[PDB]
Amino acid sequence: SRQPLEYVKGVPLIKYFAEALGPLQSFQARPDDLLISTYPKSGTTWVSQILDMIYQGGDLEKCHRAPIFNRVPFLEFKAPGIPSGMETLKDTPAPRLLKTHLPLALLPQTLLDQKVKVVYVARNAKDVAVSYYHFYHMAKVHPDPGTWDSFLEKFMVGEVCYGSWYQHVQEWWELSRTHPVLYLFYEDMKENPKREIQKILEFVGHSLPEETVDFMVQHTSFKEMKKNPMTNYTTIPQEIMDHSISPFMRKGMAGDWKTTFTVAQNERFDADYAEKMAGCSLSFRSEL
Ligand SMILES: Nc1ncnc2c1ncn2[C@@H]1O[C@H](COP(=O)(O)O)[C@@H](OP(=O)(O)O)[C@H]1O
Ligand SMILES: N#Cc1cc2ccc(O)cc2oc1=O
């Protein structure tokens, strides 16, 4: 493991994800599919759990039928010993929830032709960066992230798995212009999850009772999801993920980046960020 990244169409990737793209070429989307798309560490699991509960009518015992990574197939996923997004998906009953981090340049065209509904979650880049740094350590398939300063440097030039956060959040934002895309923010979800959930409920067309929403709002909170082995990844083998080094469910906070970023890193990050997100309507909250 810890192989360096491989590049495909300008997108750096973990070697195994890269290979995954082959079999991923045969994939056929259905009109009733729903795609969960985020830049890594931006709240994929949060919203996956939310979405699956909606798909099970709120029943909690049904959501414990299997790991979230089995309930929500990971499109580009493939790893040494353990089913590939494509396998797991063969036994996946419709309507299907699917997970991806792929930028548009790599996204299977079938998804756009079938006009598949997309739920996109964005998070502030500073928190994403810190989160991703910690994730790199614990998720052993990735290259050495190095020191934090070193990793922060790569993250600014997009030399991390999945490429530039700046390109990802902006390209799906423009797609939303003209594809059914619910475009959400991690920090809004943090602020008032109930509100975000109604948005999701509306988006997917379903409608659920208050009692049921508050129910979901609470079994989708960080602590509950941190408790639940069907969401905390603690059944994924040690070799792929060691939660000792760092939990998948680490902090779940907005503003955590302030205890990692140095003042110098912050000033340099802010200056470069301006340049890159210039002429863009996207407006992020670094803190609540
Ligand atoms: N229910 C929840 N509420 C808030 N944050 C959550 C959450 N479940 C997971 N997260 C956080 O989302 C990040 C991982 O997202 P993804 O699923 O996209 O990889 C981690 O952030 P931290 O590293 O800040 O803890 C994780 O703690
Ligand atoms: N190896 C590996 C993994 C990479 C990975 C990347 C993104 C993600 O959301 C979940 C992931 O889970 C993994 O097990």
Tab-separated table of all heavy atoms in Angstrom, residues 8-50:
chain	number	residue	atom	x	y	z
A	8	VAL	N	-5.162	10.387	-14.147
A	8	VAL	CA	-6.025	10.055	-15.268
A	8	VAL	C	-6.810	11.298	-15.662
A	8	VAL	O	-7.541	11.861	-14.850
A	8	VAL	CB	-7.000	8.911	-14.915
A	8	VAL	CG1	-7.876	8.561	-16.113
A	8	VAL	CG2	-6.228	7.685	-14.433
A	9	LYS	N	-6.637	11.734	-16.904
A	9	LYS	CA	-7.324	12.922	-17.402
A	9	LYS	C	-7.152	14.124	-16.471
A	9	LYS	O	-8.079	14.911	-16.282
A	9	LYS	CB	-8.809	12.627	-17.629
A	9	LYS	CG	-9.080	11.577	-18.694
A	9	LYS	CD	-10.534	11.599	-19.140
A	9	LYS	CE	-10.834	10.449	-20.091
A	9	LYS	NZ	-12.187	10.565	-20.707
A	10	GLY	N	-5.957	14.265	-15.901
A	10	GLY	CA	-5.629	15.416	-15.061
A	10	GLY	C	-6.073	15.269	-13.618
A	10	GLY	O	-5.924	16.193	-12.811
A	11	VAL	N	-6.628	14.108	-13.289
A	11	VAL	CA	-7.107	13.855	-11.939
A	11	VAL	C	-6.226	12.830	-11.237
A	11	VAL	O	-6.141	11.683	-11.662
A	11	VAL	CB	-8.564	13.352	-11.941
A	11	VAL	CG1	-9.066	13.168	-10.512
A	11	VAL	CG2	-9.464	14.314	-12.706
A	12	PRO	N	-5.564	13.247	-10.151
A	12	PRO	CA	-4.743	12.316	-9.381
A	12	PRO	C	-5.626	11.345	-8.597
A	12	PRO	O	-6.680	11.733	-8.110
A	12	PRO	CB	-3.954	13.228	-8.428
A	12	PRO	CG	-4.466	14.633	-8.646
A	12	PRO	CD	-5.667	14.573	-9.523
A	13	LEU	N	-5.204	10.090	-8.487
A	13	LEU	CA	-6.020	9.087	-7.814
A	13	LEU	C	-5.197	7.971	-7.192
A	13	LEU	O	-4.136	7.590	-7.698
A	13	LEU	CB	-7.033	8.463	-8.785
A	13	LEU	CG	-8.192	9.319	-9.307
A	13	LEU	CD1	-8.928	8.584	-10.416
A	13	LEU	CD2	-9.146	9.678	-8.194
A	14	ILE	N	-5.716	7.449	-6.090
A	14	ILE	CA	-5.234	6.211	-5.511
A	14	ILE	C	-5.238	5.148	-6.608
A	14	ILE	O	-6.196	5.045	-7.373
A	14	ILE	CB	-6.152	5.781	-4.355
A	14	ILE	CG1	-6.639	7.019	-3.591
A	14	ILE	CG2	-5.439	4.828	-3.424
A	14	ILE	CD1	-7.578	6.704	-2.449
A	15	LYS	N	-4.161	4.371	-6.692
A	15	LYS	CA	-3.991	3.407	-7.776
A	15	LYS	C	-5.239	2.553	-7.991
A	15	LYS	O	-5.663	2.332	-9.126
A	15	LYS	CB	-2.775	2.511	-7.505
A	15	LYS	CG	-2.422	1.538	-8.629
A	15	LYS	CD	-1.869	2.256	-9.861
A	15	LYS	CE	-0.676	3.142	-9.509
A	15	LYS	NZ	-0.148	3.871	-10.697
A	16	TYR	N	-5.829	2.076	-6.900
A	16	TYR	CA	-6.971	1.170	-6.988
A	16	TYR	C	-8.214	1.848	-7.562
A	16	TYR	O	-8.943	1.253	-8.358
A	16	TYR	CB	-7.271	0.552	-5.621
A	16	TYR	CG	-6.097	-0.210	-5.046
A	16	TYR	CD1	-5.494	0.195	-3.862
A	16	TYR	CD2	-5.582	-1.319	-5.698
A	16	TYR	CE1	-4.418	-0.490	-3.337
A	16	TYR	CE2	-4.502	-2.015	-5.179
A	16	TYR	CZ	-3.924	-1.595	-3.999
A	16	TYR	OH	-2.852	-2.276	-3.475
A	17	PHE	N	-8.455	3.091	-7.164
A	17	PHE	CA	-9.568	3.843	-7.727
A	17	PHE	C	-9.370	3.984	-9.227
A	17	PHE	O	-10.319	3.876	-10.000
A	17	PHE	CB	-9.677	5.218	-7.075
A	17	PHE	CG	-10.180	5.179	-5.664
A	17	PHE	CD1	-10.002	4.050	-4.884
A	17	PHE	CD2	-10.814	6.279	-5.108
A	17	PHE	CE1	-10.457	4.008	-3.581
A	17	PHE	CE2	-11.268	6.246	-3.806
A	17	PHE	CZ	-11.084	5.100	-3.039
A	18	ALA	N	-8.124	4.218	-9.632
A	18	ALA	CA	-7.795	4.415	-11.038
A	18	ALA	C	-8.190	3.200	-11.866
A	18	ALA	O	-8.910	3.325	-12.859
A	18	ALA	CB	-6.319	4.716	-11.196
A	19	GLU	N	-7.724	2.024	-11.450
A	19	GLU	CA	-8.120	0.780	-12.097
A	19	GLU	C	-9.643	0.673	-12.130
A	19	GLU	O	-10.225	0.321	-13.155
A	19	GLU	CB	-7.517	-0.429	-11.375
A	19	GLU	CG	-6.010	-0.340	-11.155
A	19	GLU	CD	-5.427	-1.596	-10.527
A	19	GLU	OE1	-6.205	-2.451	-10.049
A	19	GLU	OE2	-4.183	-1.730	-10.512
A	20	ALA	N	-10.285	0.993	-11.011
A	20	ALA	CA	-11.743	0.918	-10.919
A	20	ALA	C	-12.436	1.546	-12.127
A	20	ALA	O	-13.518	1.108	-12.524
A	20	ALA	CB	-12.235	1.568	-9.629
A	21	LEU	N	-11.813	2.567	-12.710
A	21	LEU	CA	-12.416	3.299	-13.825
A	21	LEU	C	-12.709	2.415	-15.030
A	21	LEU	O	-13.583	2.725	-15.838
A	21	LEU	CB	-11.519	4.455	-14.253
A	21	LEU	CG	-11.265	5.526	-13.199
A	21	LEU	CD1	-10.215	6.498	-13.705
A	21	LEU	CD2	-12.562	6.243	-12.837
A	22	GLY	N	-11.966	1.323	-15.159
A	22	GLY	CA	-12.184	0.390	-16.253
A	22	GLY	C	-13.563	-0.228	-16.166
A	22	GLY	O	-14.433	0.066	-16.984
A	23	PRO	N	-13.770	-1.099	-15.169
A	23	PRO	CA	-15.071	-1.722	-14.949
A	23	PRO	C	-16.188	-0.690	-14.858
A	23	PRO	O	-17.328	-0.977	-15.221
A	23	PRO	CB	-14.889	-2.432	-13.607
A	23	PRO	CG	-13.442	-2.782	-13.577
A	23	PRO	CD	-12.737	-1.643	-14.268
A	24	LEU	N	-15.850	0.503	-14.382
A	24	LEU	CA	-16.815	1.586	-14.231
A	24	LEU	C	-17.304	2.088	-15.588
A	24	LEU	O	-18.231	2.892	-15.667
A	24	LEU	CB	-16.188	2.733	-13.428
A	24	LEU	CG	-17.073	3.869	-12.903
A	24	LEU	CD1	-16.931	5.126	-13.755
A	24	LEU	CD2	-18.531	3.440	-12.779
A	25	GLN	N	-16.679	1.607	-16.654
A	25	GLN	CA	-17.039	2.032	-18.001
A	25	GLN	C	-18.318	1.339	-18.471
A	25	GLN	O	-19.046	1.865	-19.312
A	25	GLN	CB	-15.894	1.734	-18.968
A	25	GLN	CG	-15.870	2.615	-20.205
A	25	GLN	CD	-15.151	3.931	-19.973
A	25	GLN	OE1	-15.209	4.503	-18.884
A	25	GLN	NE2	-14.464	4.417	-21.001
A	26	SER	N	-18.585	0.156	-17.923
A	26	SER	CA	-19.769	-0.618	-18.293
A	26	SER	C	-21.034	-0.161	-17.558
A	26	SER	O	-22.148	-0.506	-17.951
A	26	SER	CB	-19.527	-2.108	-18.036
A	26	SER	OG	-18.519	-2.619	-18.892
A	27	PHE	N	-20.854	0.617	-16.495
A	27	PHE	CA	-21.963	1.070	-15.652
A	27	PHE	C	-23.087	1.760	-16.432
A	27	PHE	O	-22.839	2.653	-17.243
A	27	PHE	CB	-21.428	1.997	-14.551
A	27	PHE	CG	-22.496	2.720	-13.781
A	27	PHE	CD1	-23.258	2.057	-12.831
A	27	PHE	CD2	-22.728	4.067	-13.998
A	27	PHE	CE1	-24.243	2.727	-12.116
A	27	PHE	CE2	-23.707	4.743	-13.288
A	27	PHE	CZ	-24.465	4.071	-12.345
A	28	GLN	N	-24.322	1.331	-16.178
A	28	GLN	CA	-25.505	1.951	-16.775
A	28	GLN	C	-26.383	2.567	-15.686
A	28	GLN	O	-26.856	1.867	-14.791
A	28	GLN	CB	-26.320	0.924	-17.570
A	28	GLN	CG	-25.634	0.378	-18.819
A	28	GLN	CD	-26.438	-0.733	-19.495
A	28	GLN	OE1	-26.623	-0.732	-20.712
A	28	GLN	NE2	-26.919	-1.682	-18.700
A	29	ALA	N	-26.602	3.875	-15.767
A	29	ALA	CA	-27.448	4.558	-14.796
A	29	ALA	C	-28.925	4.325	-15.085
A	29	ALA	O	-29.316	4.092	-16.231
A	29	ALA	CB	-27.143	6.042	-14.777
A	30	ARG	N	-29.735	4.376	-14.032
A	30	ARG	CA	-31.184	4.292	-14.161
A	30	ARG	C	-31.779	5.661	-13.864
A	30	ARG	O	-31.212	6.426	-13.087
A	30	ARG	CB	-31.756	3.281	-13.171
A	30	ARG	CG	-31.221	1.861	-13.284
A	30	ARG	CD	-31.783	1.012	-12.146
A	30	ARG	NE	-33.198	1.310	-11.912
A	30	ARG	CZ	-34.199	0.462	-12.135
A	30	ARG	NH1	-33.956	-0.764	-12.579
A	30	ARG	NH2	-35.447	0.840	-11.899
A	31	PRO	N	-32.932	5.974	-14.469
A	31	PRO	CA	-33.582	7.261	-14.228
A	31	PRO	C	-33.900	7.511	-12.754
A	31	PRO	O	-34.025	8.661	-12.335
A	31	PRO	CB	-34.887	7.144	-15.022
A	31	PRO	CG	-34.600	6.137	-16.077
A	31	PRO	CD	-33.670	5.152	-15.444
A	32	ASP	N	-34.038	6.445	-11.973
A	32	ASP	CA	-34.456	6.586	-10.583
A	32	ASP	C	-33.280	6.563	-9.611
A	32	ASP	O	-33.470	6.642	-8.399
A	32	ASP	CB	-35.487	5.512	-10.214
A	32	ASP	CG	-34.936	4.107	-10.337
A	32	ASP	OD1	-33.882	3.930	-10.983
A	32	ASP	OD2	-35.556	3.178	-9.786
A	33	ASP	N	-32.065	6.455	-10.143
A	33	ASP	CA	-30.858	6.540	-9.321
A	33	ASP	C	-30.780	7.909	-8.669
A	33	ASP	O	-31.356	8.874	-9.171
A	33	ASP	CB	-29.606	6.333	-10.174
A	33	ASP	CG	-29.393	4.890	-10.572
A	33	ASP	OD1	-29.977	3.994	-9.926
A	33	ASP	OD2	-28.628	4.651	-11.532
A	34	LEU	N	-30.062	7.992	-7.555
A	34	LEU	CA	-29.770	9.276	-6.926
A	34	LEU	C	-28.300	9.310	-6.575
A	34	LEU	O	-27.827	8.463	-5.826
A	34	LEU	CB	-30.609	9.491	-5.661
A	34	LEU	CG	-30.458	10.883	-5.039
A	34	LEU	CD1	-31.657	11.233	-4.175
A	34	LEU	CD2	-29.163	11.016	-4.247
A	35	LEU	N	-27.576	10.282	-7.114
A	35	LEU	CA	-26.136	10.345	-6.887
A	35	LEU	C	-25.744	11.290	-5.745
A	35	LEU	O	-26.166	12.456	-5.683
A	35	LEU	CB	-25.388	10.695	-8.178
A	35	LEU	CG	-23.858	10.777	-8.081
A	35	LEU	CD1	-23.211	9.386	-7.943
A	35	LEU	CD2	-23.282	11.530	-9.282
A	36	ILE	N	-24.945	10.755	-4.830
A	36	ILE	CA	-24.363	11.547	-3.756
A	36	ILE	C	-22.963	11.957	-4.177
A	36	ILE	O	-22.061	11.119	-4.281
A	36	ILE	CB	-24.300	10.746	-2.438
A	36	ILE	CG1	-25.708	10.316	-2.017
A	36	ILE	CG2	-23.603	11.548	-1.347
A	36	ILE	CD1	-25.779	9.691	-0.659
A	37	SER	N	-22.780	13.240	-4.451
A	37	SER	CA	-21.488	13.705	-4.931
A	37	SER	C	-20.876	14.786	-4.049
A	37	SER	O	-21.481	15.845	-3.812
A	37	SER	CB	-21.595	14.192	-6.372
A	37	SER	OG	-20.463	14.969	-6.710
A	38	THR	N	-19.667	14.519	-3.574
A	38	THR	CA	-18.932	15.486	-2.769
A	38	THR	C	-17.440	15.382	-3.011
A	38	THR	O	-16.932	14.322	-3.393
A	38	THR	CB	-19.128	15.220	-1.270
A	38	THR	OG1	-18.519	13.959	-0.930
A	38	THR	CG2	-20.611	15.188	-0.920
A	39	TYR	N	-16.737	16.487	-2.767
A	39	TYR	CA	-15.302	16.423	-2.565
A	39	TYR	C	-15.075	15.680	-1.254
A	39	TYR	O	-15.812	15.880	-0.289
A	39	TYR	CB	-14.694	17.825	-2.508
A	39	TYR	CG	-13.184	17.821	-2.579
A	39	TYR	CD1	-12.526	17.727	-3.804
A	39	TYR	CD2	-12.414	17.897	-1.425
A	39	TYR	CE1	-11.145	17.710	-3.875
A	39	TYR	CE2	-11.034	17.881	-1.486
A	39	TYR	CZ	-10.403	17.788	-2.710
A	39	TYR	OH	-9.027	17.768	-2.756
A	40	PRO	N	-14.056	14.810	-1.211
A	40	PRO	CA	-13.769	14.018	-0.026
A	40	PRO	C	-13.843	14.830	1.262
A	40	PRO	O	-13.505	16.018	1.273
A	40	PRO	CB	-12.329	13.564	-0.258
A	40	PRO	CG	-12.197	13.495	-1.725
A	40	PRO	CD	-13.037	14.625	-2.257
A	41	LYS	N	-14.285	14.174	2.334
A	41	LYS	CA	-14.358	14.762	3.670
A	41	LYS	C	-15.331	15.931	3.779
A	41	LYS	O	-15.241	16.713	4.723
A	41	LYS	CB	-12.977	15.224	4.170
A	41	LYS	CG	-11.811	14.266	3.940
A	41	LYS	CD	-12.168	12.801	4.180
A	41	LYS	CE	-12.752	12.558	5.555
A	41	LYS	NZ	-13.199	11.142	5.690
A	42	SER	N	-16.257	16.061	2.834
A	42	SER	CA	-17.211	17.170	2.875
A	42	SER	C	-18.592	16.781	3.409
A	42	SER	O	-19.526	17.587	3.372
A	42	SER	CB	-17.344	17.825	1.501
A	42	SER	OG	-16.101	18.354	1.059
A	43	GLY	N	-18.722	15.558	3.915
A	43	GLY	CA	-19.969	15.124	4.543
A	43	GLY	C	-20.739	14.053	3.790
A	43	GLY	O	-21.963	13.981	3.891
A	44	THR	N	-20.020	13.218	3.048
A	44	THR	CA	-20.629	12.163	2.248
A	44	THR	C	-21.453	11.239	3.122
A	44	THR	O	-22.584	10.892	2.791
A	44	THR	CB	-19.568	11.266	1.560
A	44	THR	OG1	-18.486	12.063	1.065
A	44	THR	CG2	-20.193	10.500	0.408
A	45	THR	N	-20.860	10.820	4.232
A	45	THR	CA	-21.493	9.838	5.091
A	45	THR	C	-22.698	10.448	5.787
A	45	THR	O	-23.754	9.821	5.887
A	45	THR	CB	-20.511	9.293	6.132
A	45	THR	OG1	-19.250	9.039	5.505
A	45	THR	CG2	-21.040	8.001	6.728
A	46	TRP	N	-22.540	11.677	6.263
A	46	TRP	CA	-23.651	12.366	6.889
A	46	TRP	C	-24.874	12.226	5.997
A	46	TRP	O	-25.872	11.633	6.386
A	46	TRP	CB	-23.336	13.851	7.106
A	46	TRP	CG	-24.219	14.490	8.135
A	46	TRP	CD1	-25.333	13.948	8.702
A	46	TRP	CD2	-24.081	15.801	8.698
A	46	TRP	NE1	-25.888	14.830	9.592
A	46	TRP	CE2	-25.140	15.975	9.609
A	46	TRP	CE3	-23.159	16.838	8.527
A	46	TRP	CZ2	-25.305	17.147	10.350
A	46	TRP	CZ3	-23.326	18.001	9.259
A	46	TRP	CH2	-24.392	18.146	10.160
A	47	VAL	N	-24.780	12.766	4.789
A	47	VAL	CA	-25.918	12.818	3.885
A	47	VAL	C	-26.347	11.435	3.380
A	47	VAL	O	-27.517	11.216	3.076
A	47	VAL	CB	-25.633	13.747	2.698
A	47	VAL	CG1	-24.644	13.102	1.742
A	47	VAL	CG2	-26.927	14.105	1.988
A	48	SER	N	-25.403	10.505	3.299
A	48	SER	CA	-25.718	9.142	2.893
A	48	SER	C	-26.677	8.522	3.887
A	48	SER	O	-27.705	7.955	3.512
A	48	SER	CB	-24.450	8.295	2.822
A	48	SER	OG	-23.604	8.741	1.781
A	49	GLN	N	-26.326	8.630	5.163
A	49	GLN	CA	-27.173	8.140	6.239
A	49	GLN	C	-28.536	8.830	6.197
A	49	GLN	O	-29.567	8.166	6.250
A	49	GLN	CB	-26.489	8.349	7.592
A	49	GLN	CG	-27.284	7.832	8.788
A	49	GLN	CD	-27.346	6.310	8.858
A	49	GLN	OE1	-26.731	5.610	8.049
A	49	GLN	NE2	-28.090	5.793	9.832
A	50	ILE	N	-28.547	10.155	6.083
A	50	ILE	CA	-29.803	10.880	5.946
A	50	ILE	C	-30.649	10.280	4.828
A	50	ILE	O	-31.807	9.917	5.038
A	50	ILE	CB	-29.582	12.376	5.633
A	50	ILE	CG1	-29.135	13.124	6.891
A	50	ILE	CG2	-30.859	12.996	5.089
A	50	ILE	CD1	-28.652	14.538	6.629
